[PDB]
DNA sequence: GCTGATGCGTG
DNA sequence: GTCCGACCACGCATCAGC
């Protein structure tokens, strides 16, 4: 019986402790549960063991059943460059719940307000046979297929098919999944940690029953973590080289993991998760954590990370940091290739920076215009914004993988083996120093040359390319590295752990020549979940059923509450930024634009300040000027 | 065709 | 101080209802 399924108790037997006999399938029940007991226990450690648990059952009795499973826990359809989205949303999936329960959609949107969960709406009120892991998954591709006129009620008739099936717990955690917030506490990487844990502790290929149900018997709990650790190891360096679970779970299954790297190499074609960088506080932080190794500044860029891929044969791939596929988004990018190589050039894997170049200024043009690219279906012709690629890292070149040489000799083969064109394919604008007042030059060069700053990456030592790591070895040198009293008049319903509340709040400033309060930014960092939920009745009494006639916000996202203006916030910022959307000094720095506040946080609350006292318009452009 | 509502993606 | 999972703003893209 599938409802008394418990993945989190001690001494777990993969055969006598699961919840279905082997050879039939996974039942999705099973694997609600498992997210039940993950979301109870209160150790990362103790979640990771809990969905292991799981795995061990699924690797034993139902294989087959692994890689539905494992695309269910992590709340995705496949991998990451079939491009395959659900089309659903809170407003589809409500429809769906009001459909399946035969009451109005108000008050079935009221409901998931009040609640911030549209699970628990979906659970709370609702023979078909058990829904099944790889029953629910088919039924989630099935969806994603489904496009253009009249496709809506196709995907809600196979959620609502969903819903009458749903039992215990189903419905919750269909419903949270189908709206891309499952908030399981576990991803990427806890799932494969869970996943070589599985397989070592119960490995696969074995005859029913087996013989091997804990490998880890035996061990002391040092050498068991110290075990399970490096096999983990495996498991993650192999994957960050092939991140297609279609292509390593069929691979780990037949030949088992420590096997798996002879197997699956990285090859042009398969997108990678891209090396990234850390923050710095300043230039003497950089030498501090780089001791003595010799490093390179280059100019940080405002574009998209580009990974693109040639493979041997002529084709060519692009890839955002996600791994999506955006070859059709730039059929500019694909018809500058082979004025970018050299003829001995035959297969690559470049990382790159797009970023929109202004052809006839022959100039940078900031990422905001870069968004305005067309992104379906692009002619060549039709192209707007152009682009020009900042390449500054080589990974794969005519057959052979560069990672883990030093980026010294990476850059060396990229300079090499590609060819530079103004405006078109350029190395990144590099300075390769040790002198602290160069570097400084060096960094106020990179933002007058409308940059972000530099980043720092070191040549010889600690110098590999980390695939799908934020690194140690890349340091950011940026600009951003203003307090405001703004007026609260407005609040959006909560989500998550802010489900009985408020999630976010709607900020305005004081015009001074209109008396009026112009929306500026929405806030919903920098509150500590005691002071959000002790406070929250407060605000909740300023609630009104109207917008009073003074306060403007244009397009704005209309807040969920109207809020009496009373309530002034001492709010910092990055910086401010021209805006389309919110209406504080529309026209006092532009004359279409306004003025918003980049990555908000709140402070501390100005009780002794009334909203005519907030920081005015005025203020708000004179700031701007200067930022 | 038009439009308000609704969904996706990344830096 | 490090690692990890969740979240988001603003651009374009999609679609019901008429
Ligand atoms: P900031 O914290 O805005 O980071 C900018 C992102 O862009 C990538 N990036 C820009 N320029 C470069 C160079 N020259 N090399 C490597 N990466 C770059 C950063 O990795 C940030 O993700």
Same mark, same amino acid.
């Given at each position: 019986?599938?409802?008394?399924?418990?993945?989190?108790?001690?001494?777990?037997?993969?055969?006598?402790?699961?919840?279905?006999?082997?050879?039939?399938?996974?039942?999705?029940?099973?694997?609600?549960?498992?997210?039940?007991?993950?979301?109870?226990?209160?150790?990362?450690?103790?979640?990771?063991?809990?969905?292991?648990?799981?795995?061990?059952?699924?690797?034993?009795?139902?294989? %087959? &059943?692994?890689?539905?499973?494992?695309?269910?826990?992590?709340?995705?359809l496949?991998?990451?460059?079939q491009?395959? !989205?659900?089309?659903?949303?809170?407003?589809?999936?409500?429809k769906?719940?009001?459909?399946?329960?035969?009451?109005?959609?108000?008050?079935?949107?009221?409901?998931?307000? #009040?609640?911030?969960?549209?699970?628990?709406?979906?659970?709370?009120? /609702?023979?078909?046979?058990?829904?099944?892991?790889?029953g629910?998954?088919?039924?989630?591709?099935?969806?994603?297929?489904?496009?253009?006129?009249?496709?809506?009620?196709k995907?809600?008739?196979?959620?609502?098919?969903?819903?009458?099936?749903?039992?215990?717990? #189903?419905?919750?955690?269909?419903?949270?999944?189908?709206?891309?917030?499952?908030?399981?506490?576990?991803?990427?990487?806890?799932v494969?940690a869970?996943?070589?844990?599985?397989?070592?502790?119960?490995?696969?290929?074995?005859?029913?029953?087996?013989?091997?149900? &804990?490998?880890?018997?035996?061990?002391?709990?040092?050498?068991?973590?110290?075990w399970?650790?490096?096999?983990?190891?495996?498991?993650? +360096?192999?994957?960050?080289?092939?991140?297609?679970? *279609?292509?390593?779970?069929?691979?780990?299954?037949?030949?088992?993991? #420590? /096997?798996?790297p002879?197997?699956?190499?990285?090859?042009?074609?398969?997108?990678?998760?891209?090396?990234?960088?850390?923050?710095?506080?300043?230039?003497? #932080?950089?030498?501090?954590?780089?001791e003595?190794?010799?490093?390179?500044?280059?100019?940080?860029? *405002?574009?998209?990370?580009?990974?693109?891929?040639?493979?041997?044969?002529?084709?060519?791939?692009?890839?955002?940091?996600?791994? !999506? *596929?955006?070859?059709?988004?730039? %059929?500019?990018?694909?018809?500058?290739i082979?004025?970018?190589?050299?003829?001995?050039?035959?297969?690559?894997?470049?990382?790159? =920076?797009?970023?929109?170049?202004?052809?006839?200024?022959?100039?940078?043009?900031?990422?905001?215009?870069?968004?305005?690219?067309?992104?379906? $279906?692009?002619?060549?012709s =039709?192209?707007?914004?152009?682009?020009?690629?900042?390449?500054? @890292?080589?990974?794969?070149?005519?057959?052979?993988?560069?990672?883990?040489?030093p980026?010294?000799?990476?850059?060396?083969?990229?300079? $090499?083996?590609?060819?530079?064109?103004?405006?078109?394919?350029?190395?990144?604008?590099?300075? &390769?120093?040790?002198?602290?007042?160069?570097?400084?030059?060096?960094? $106020?060069?990179?933002?007058?040359?409308?940059?972000?700053?530099?980043?720092?990456?070191?040549?010889?030592?600690?110098?590999?390319?980390?695939?799908?790591?934020?690194?140690?070895?890349?340091?950011?040198?940026?600009? &951003?590295?203003?307090?405001l009293?703004?007026?609260?008049?407005?609040?959006?319903?909560?989500?998550?752990?802010?489900?009985?509340?408020?999630?976010?709040?709607?900020?305005?400033?004081?015009?001074?020549?209109?008396?009026?309060?112009? !929306?500026?930014?929405?806030?919903?960092?920098?509150?500590?979940?005691?002071?959000? $939920? =002790?406070?929250?009745?407060?605000?909740?009494?300023?609630?009104?059923?109207? %917008?009073?006639?003074?306060?403007?916000? @244009?397009?704005?996202?209309?807040? @969920?509450?109207?809020?009496?203006?009373?309530?002034?916030?001492?709010?910092?910022?990055? *910086?401010?930024?021209?805006?389309?959307?919110?209406?504080?000094?529309?026209?006092?720095? @532009?004359?279409?634009?306004?003025?918003?506040?980049?990555?908000?946080?709140?402070? /501390?609350?100005?009780?002794?300040? +009334?909203?005519?006292?907030?920081?005015?318009?005025?203020?708000?452009?004179?700031?701007?000027?200067?930022?």
């Amino acid at each position: 019986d599938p409802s008394g399924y418990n993945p989190a108790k001690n001494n777990y037997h993969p055969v006598e402790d699961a919840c279905w006999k082997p050879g039939q399938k996974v039942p999705y029940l099973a694997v609600a549960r498992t997210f039940e007991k993950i979301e109870e226990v209160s150790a990362r450690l103790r979640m990771v063991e809990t969905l292991s648990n799981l795995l061990r059952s699924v690797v034993a009795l139902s294989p %087959p &059943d692994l890689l539905p499973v494992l695309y269910l826990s992590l709340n995705h359809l496949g991998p990451p460059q079939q491009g395959l !989205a659900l089309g659903v949303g809170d407003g589809v999936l409500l429809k769906a719940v009001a459909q399946a329960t035969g009451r109005q959609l108000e008050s079935v949107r009221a409901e998931a307000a #009040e609640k911030g969960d549209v699970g628990l709406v979906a659970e709370n009120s /609702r023979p078909p046979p058990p829904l099944t892991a790889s029953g629910v998954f088919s039924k989630f591709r099935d969806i994603a297929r489904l496009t253009g006129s009249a496709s809506t009620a196709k995907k809600i008739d196979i959620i609502k098919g969903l819903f009458v099936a749903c039992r215990h717990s #189903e419905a919750r955690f269909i419903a949270r999944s189908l709206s891309g917030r499952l908030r399981l506490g576990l991803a990427e990487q806890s799932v494969l940690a869970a996943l070589s844990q599985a397989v070592s502790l119960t490995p696969p290929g074995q005859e029913f029953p087996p013989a091997m149900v &804990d490998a880890g018997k035996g061990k002391t709990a040092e050498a068991r973590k110290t075990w399970l650790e490096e096999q983990g190891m495996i498991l993650k +360096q192999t994957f960050c080289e092939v991140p297609d679970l *279609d292509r390593i779970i069929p691979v780990l299954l037949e030949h088992g993991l #420590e /096997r798996l790297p002879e197997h699956c190499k990285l090859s042009p074609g398969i997108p990678l998760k891209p090396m990234l960088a850390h923050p710095t506080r300043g230039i003497s #932080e950089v030498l501090k954590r780089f001791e003595e190794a010799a490093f390179t500044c280059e100019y940080k860029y *405002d574009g998209q990370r580009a990974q693109i891929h040639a493979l041997e044969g002529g084709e060519v791939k692009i890839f955002s940091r996600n791994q !999506a *596929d955006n070859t059709g988004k730039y %059929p500019d990018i694909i018809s500058r290739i082979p004025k970018i190589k050299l003829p001995s050039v035959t297969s690559f894997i470049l990382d790159t =920076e797009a970023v929109a170049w202004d052809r006839e200024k022959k100039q940078i043009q900031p990422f905001q215009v870069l968004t305005t690219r067309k992104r379906k $279906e692009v002619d060549a012709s =039709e192209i707007q914004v152009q682009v020009c690629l900042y390449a500054f @890292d080589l990974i794969y070149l005519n057959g052979e993988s560069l990672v883990r040489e030093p980026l010294s000799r990476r850059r060396q083969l990229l300079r $090499e083996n590609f060819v530079e064109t103004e405006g078109e394919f350029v190395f990144a604008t590099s300075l &390769d120093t040790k002198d602290i007042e160069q570097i400084a030059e060096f960094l $106020e060069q990179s933002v007058k040359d409308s940059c972000e700053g530099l980043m720092v990456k070191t040549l010889d030592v600690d110098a590999t390319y980390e695939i799908a790591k934020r690194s140690h070895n890349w340091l950011k040198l940026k600009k &951003d590295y203003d307090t405001l009293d703004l007026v609260v008049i407005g609040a959006y319903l909560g989500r998550g752990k802010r489900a009985g509340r408020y999630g976010g709040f709607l900020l305005a400033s004081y015009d001074e020549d209109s008396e009026e309060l112009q !929306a500026i930014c929405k806030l919903g960092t920098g509150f500590s979940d005691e002071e959000l $939920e =002790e406070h929250h009745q407060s605000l909740k009494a300023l609630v009104l059923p109207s %917008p009073r006639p003074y306060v403007r916000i @244009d397009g704005a996202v209309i807040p @969920d509450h109207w809020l009496d203006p009373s309530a002034v916030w001492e709010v910092k910022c990055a *910086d401010l930024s021209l805006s389309p959307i919110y209406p504080a000094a529309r026209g006092l720095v @532009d004359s279409d634009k306004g003025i918003s506040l980049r990555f908000p946080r709140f402070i /501390r609350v100005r009780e002794d300040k +009334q909203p005519e006292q907030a920081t005015t318009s005025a203020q708000v452009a004179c700031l701007y000027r200067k930022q």
